[PDB]
Amino acid sequence: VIEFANCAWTRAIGQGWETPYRVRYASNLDDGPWYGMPLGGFGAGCIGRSSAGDFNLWHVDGGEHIFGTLPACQFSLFEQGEQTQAYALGSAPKDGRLSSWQWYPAGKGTYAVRYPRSWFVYEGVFRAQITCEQFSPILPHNYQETSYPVAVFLWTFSNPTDQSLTLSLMLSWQNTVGWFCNTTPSSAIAIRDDGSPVYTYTPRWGQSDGNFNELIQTESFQGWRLRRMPHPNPPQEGDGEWAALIPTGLGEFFGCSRWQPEGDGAHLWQSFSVDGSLPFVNDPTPAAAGEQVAAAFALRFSLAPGERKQIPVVLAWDFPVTEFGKGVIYYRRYTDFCDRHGTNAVTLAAQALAAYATWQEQIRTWQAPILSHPDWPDWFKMALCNELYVLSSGGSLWSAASDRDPVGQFAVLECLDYRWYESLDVRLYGSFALLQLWPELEKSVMRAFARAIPTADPTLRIIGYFYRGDPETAYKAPRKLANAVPHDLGAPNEHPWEKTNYTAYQDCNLWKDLASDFVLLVYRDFLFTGGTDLNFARECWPAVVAALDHLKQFDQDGDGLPENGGAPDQTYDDWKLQGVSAYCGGLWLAALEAAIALGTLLQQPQVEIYRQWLSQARPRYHQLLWNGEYYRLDTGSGSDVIMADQLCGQFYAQLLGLVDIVPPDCCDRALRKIYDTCFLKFHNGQFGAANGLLPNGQPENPHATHPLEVWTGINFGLAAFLWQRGMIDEAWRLAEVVVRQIYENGLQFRTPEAITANGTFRACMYLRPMAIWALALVSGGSRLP
Numbered sequence: 001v002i003e004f005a006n007c008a009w010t011r012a013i014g015q016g017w018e019t020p021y022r023v024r025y026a027s028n029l030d031d032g033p034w035y036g037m038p039l040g041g042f043g044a045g046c047i048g049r050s051s052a053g054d055f056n057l058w059h060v061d062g063g064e065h066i067f068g069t070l071p072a073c074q075f076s077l078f079e080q081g082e083q084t085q086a087y088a089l090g091s092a093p094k095d096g097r098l099s100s101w102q103w104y105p106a107g108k109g110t111y112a113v114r115y116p117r118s119w120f121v122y123e124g125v126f127r128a129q130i131t132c133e134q135f136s137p138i139l140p141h142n143y144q145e146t147s148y149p150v151a152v153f154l155w156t157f158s159n160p161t162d163q164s165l166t167l168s169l170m171l172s173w174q175n176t177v178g179w180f181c182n183t184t185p186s187s188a189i190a191i192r193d194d195g196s197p198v199y200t201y202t203p204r205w206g207q208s209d210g211n212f213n214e215l216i217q218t219e220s221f222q223g224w225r226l227r228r229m230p231h232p233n234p235p236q237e238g239d240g241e242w243a244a245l246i247p248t249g250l251g252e253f254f255g256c257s258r259w260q261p262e263g264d265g266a267h268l269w270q271s272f273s274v275d276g277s278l279p280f281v282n283d284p285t286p287a288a289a290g291e292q293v294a295a296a297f298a299l300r301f302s303l304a305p306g307e308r309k310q311i312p313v314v315l316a317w318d319f320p321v322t323e324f325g326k327g328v329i330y331y332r333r334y335t336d337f338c339d340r341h342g343t344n345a346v347t348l349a350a351q352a353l354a355a356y357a358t359w360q361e362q363i364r365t366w367q368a369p370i371l372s373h374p375d376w377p378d379w380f381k382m383a384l385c386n387e388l389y390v391l392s393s394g395g396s397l398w399s400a401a402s403d404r405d406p407v408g409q410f411a412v413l414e415c416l417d418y419r420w421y422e423s424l425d426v427r428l429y430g431s432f433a434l435l436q437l438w439p440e441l442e443k444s445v446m447r448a449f450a451r452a453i454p455t456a457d458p459t460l461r462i463i464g465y466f467y468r469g470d471p472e473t474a475y476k477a478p479r480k481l482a483n484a485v486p487h488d489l490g491a492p493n494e495h496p497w498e499k500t501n502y503t504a505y506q507d508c509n510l511w512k513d514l515a516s517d518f519v520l521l522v523y524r525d526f527l528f529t530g531g532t533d534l535n536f537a538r539e540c541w542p543a544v545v546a547a548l549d550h551l552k553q554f555d556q557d558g559d560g561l562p563e564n565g566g567a568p569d570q571t572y573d574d575w576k577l578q579g580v581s582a583y584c585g586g587l588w589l590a591a592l593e594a595a596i597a598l599g600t601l602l603q604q605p606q607v608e609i610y611r612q613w614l615s616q617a618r619p620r621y622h623q624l625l626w627n628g629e630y631y632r633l634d635t636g637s638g639s640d641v642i643m644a645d646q647l648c649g650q651f652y653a654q655l656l657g658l659v660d661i662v663p664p665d666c667c668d669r670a671l672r673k674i675y676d677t678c679f680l681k682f683h684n685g686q687f688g689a690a691n692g693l694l695p696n697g698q699p700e701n702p703h704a705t706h707p708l709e710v711w712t713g714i715n716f717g718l719a720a721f722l723w724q725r726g727m728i729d730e731a732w733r734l735a736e737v738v739v740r741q742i743y744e745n746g747l748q749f750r751t752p753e754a755i756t757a758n759g760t761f762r763a764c765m766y767l768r769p770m771a772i773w774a775l776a777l778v779s780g781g782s783r784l785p
């Protein structure tokens with residue numbers, strides 16, 4: 001019933017972790033290990049349900065994070081054969097709400113995920129065989145259903161006994177209309193102890209005044225709908241509705257539109273647990289001050305010995321507005337297929353009821369090349385799908401179409417701790433999945449970068465790295481310089497896409513990697529979507545020119561190579577570099593090569609300038625940095641550290657079909673050293689490749705941050721590089737280590753930037769690990785959807 005369970009992440013239902021990874025800094029986010037698969041489309045707002053059955057992640061407010069169970073949001077099962085049994089399929093509340101309810105025994109079945117499909121298989125409690133498959137229609141190359149705020153729960157019931165069974169399936173849900181908005185928007189921005197800017201989120205959690213629920217009963221479908229009176233027009237953030245529907249004709253429908261989710265639940269349970277019915281209630285009286293309201297329905301049916309029945313239950317949520325900074329209003333993409341009124345949940349659920357079997361067939365179809373691939377291990381097939389989860393839960397935005405953005409604009413947060421979008425350094429490896437599966441979204445992201453590059457905001461703001469607790473005294477830099485390459489596309493407390501370079505940790509006006517990243521991403525996106533989108537190319541080309549001139553100014557001595565200096569000036573933003581670095585120098589060489597290739601196609605005059613620079617810079621890079629076994633960190637520090645990601649530029653150059661930026665034998669020697677040192681002499685290869693070690697496997701400084709962390713996404717980029725250079729076995733072994741760390745130690749569906757050798761993590765729900773797709777791309781040959 002679970003298709004290809006070996007290519008799925010599995011855990012017994014409600015089975016926890018003895019010692020899961022924990023956050024390395026106490027100021028940062030750690031909700032604990034009970035993340036399950038997120039439900040809902042990209043930019044739809046999403047909800048997540050744990051492997052214990054709890055609906056515990058609430059991302060209905062775009063870009064905002066709420067973790068916590070609403071126990072009344074739950075499926076419950078009744079069975080009568082010889083005995084009678086009924087259970088709610090989550091954890092017993094720790095506070096004694098719903099005290100009359102019984103909660104399904106832990107460990108009596110399996111939870112399985114291959115995103116966007118998940119299954120609960122209950123076994124050992126009911127006589128019947130029961131599977132709930134939960135999915136949303138996440139569909140590569142589909143810019144419609146992939147945006148939808150719907151979840152399908154497909155239930156399969158089989159009777160293996162020779163005794164007839166009566167079953168009832170209940171869905172209850174609390175009405176949270178109006179909860180998911182910020183009552184303190186555009187709040188004072190603090191500097192956290194780590195130096196990141198943060199704002200205050202005060203949601204209207206538990207504020208249900210005016211909320212009301214109604215039964216839905218037509219010839220085609222029945223269920224309930226959750227609303228609020230009055231519903232303004234236009235809607236504000238938080239305004240909308242929920243609906244859940246089943247088809248008619250499957251059994252006997254009981255509807256109770258209004259019950260009390262903070263009470264003991266006995267009005268429901270007294271019926272349900274006894275015969276599988278509910279008291280009939282259609283009562284749309286709006287909730288009083290201080291009162292919570294929930295709905296429920298149940299479908300009762302018989303199952304003859306050997307019979308098998310399916311019941312599609314769909315859940316939709318229409319919350320059309322995403323407000324960022326006060327007054328900054330966007331509509332969600334899915335409104336392009338209904339409307340912007342916030343009155344369409346039944347329409348979306350009805351669509352889901354009609355199309356769910358098509359959607360499921362389509363998911364099977366796009367996963368089939370991955371699952372059948374002869375040269376990929378099962379653990380990899382699983383991780384390739386599962387790492388996609390972040391496109392839904394990473395505060396994802398997908399706005400309504402316009403003329404200049406015909407499928408909408410798109411953005412994933414860097415993470416929850418670092419609350420800004422599509423960080424350019426991070427997406428250099430993080431964006432490979434988006435490129436492969438939603439190239440139109442990928443291109444919209446890069447166009448947003450291109451539009452921002454010529455913009456400026458000269459306003460001085462505090463730089464977190466230097467902040468010492470006194471605003472008046474604190475070092476400040478201009479928010480953005482004209483033609484500098486922004487770090488990110490803004491934040492959910494300000495203005496995504498339009499107000500860029502939000503992070504204040506460093507002055508990214510000074511970064512020596514961003515410009516080269518920009519160019520490489522533009523050329524990659526053009527190249528890998530077939531080399532025919534001349535519109536994209538011509539739109540980005542002025543920004544390519546601006547970016548390369550921006551970065552050239554940091555070539556102080558005129559050898560052709562930009563020089564690192566000052567505070568950390570690249571993606572390793574705790575790590576000071578001095579002079580030409582392997583890292584930035586290499587990205588620059590690849591970027592020049594990219595601009596030359598693209599500029600030649602577009603017939604642009606700057607190509608000759610770039611060729612001149614490249615002719616000086618490429619030989620000089622090797623001449624300054626080759627030490628005999630690897631490339632030195634940088635020309636100025638005198639460090640002997642082997643930086644794992646030193647030849648990122650050579651990975652990219654070869655990926656883009658461009659000329660090698662270094663001699664190919666030196667590339668392979670360096671790569672061999674990195675593997676043998678950063679990986680095999682770091683705690684014996686137990687965690688993956690550390691970012692920087694001495695040739696003897698020791699830290700240069702034992703008090704360092706970045707050098708001694710294993711970055712998931714860097715590892716996956718390194719694995720792709722290994723594979724590309726013919727070190728196939730190495731590649732699989734490195735990638736395998738990192739996948740096992742994530743999936744075994746309680747980081748599933750919140751993959752972090754970093755793990756340590758001390759069982760800690762940094763920055764859960766991170767953008768970079770989607771770089772697993774880069775390994776898929778280099779190794780997939782012909783396949784991939």
Ligand SMILES: OC[C@H]1O[C@@H](O)[C@H](O)[C@@H](O)[C@@H]1O
Nearest residue numbers: 418423425503571572573753
């Ligand atoms: O983990 C390192 C990352 O830290 C984040 O705070 C930054 O925004 C990224 O630019 C950086 O690469």
Ligand SMILES: [Ca+2]
Nearest residue numbers: 061062323324
């Ligand atoms: Ca908001």
